[PDB]
């Protein structure tokens, strides 16, 4: 029941897998190991939807079919740092150039 994710914040992106049976809290611990900030200092989002820690990834809508190796599902991430949490801000990737005429 493996699920493939892109955890994104600002211009940072983490590629990682996880179980459907694994929880949002267990995902925060994985983020902690990488980005060195504890679970209480991070929020996880699903298109601007605050995910509950106790809920499973499957319950949040991160199914295997929806979150594939070739097309991972996005998880928003926002940190506290100052006092309150910062607003979610996923910086989009660069735009491709115009398709060459020969490829049209």
């Amino acid at each position: 029941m493996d699920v493939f994710l892109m955890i994104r914040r600002h211009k940072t992106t983490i590629f990682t897998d996880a179980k459907e049976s694994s929880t949002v809290f267990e995902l925060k611990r994985i983020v902690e190991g990488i980005l060195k900030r504890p679970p209480d200092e991070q929020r996880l989002y699903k298109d601007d939807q605050l995910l509950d820690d106790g809920k499973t990834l499957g319950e949040c809508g991160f199914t295997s079919q929806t979150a594939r190796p070739q097309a991972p599902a996005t998880v928003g991430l926002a940190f506290r740092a100052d006092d309150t949490f910062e607003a979610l801000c996923i910086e989009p990737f660069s735009s491709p150039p115009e398709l060459p005429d020969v490829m049209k």
Partner: protein, 91 residues
């Protein structure tokens, strides 16, 4: 365990070392002249390097598997830049 791959436009992709070591070029860049866990790609923009990281996940998952293998999708708009990247990374 993990490494950081940085695009030309400043996007940071954090990926399992094992996955990134799919690329022989990346292996050499990590070893360096003094090793490092970060690599900068001065000619690979974010929309390309993101696709490359997705391919690493794909390759590692579906190699040596009985389960049916889906296509690796490539939009026409990205194909040419991705080919250039793939040529350089040798994966």
């Amino acid at each position: 365990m993990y490494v950081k791959l940085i695009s030309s436009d400043g996007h940071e992709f954090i990926v399992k070392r094992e996955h990134a070591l799919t690329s022989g070029t990346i292996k050499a860049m990590l070893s360096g002249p003094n090793e490092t866990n970060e690599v900068n790609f001065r000619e690979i923009p974010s929309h390309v390097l993101s696709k490359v990281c997705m391919y690493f996940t794909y390759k590692v998952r579906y190699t040596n598997s009985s389960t049916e293998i889906p296509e690796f999708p490539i939009a026409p708009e990205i194909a040419l830049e991705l080919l250039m990247a793939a040529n350089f990374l040798d994966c």
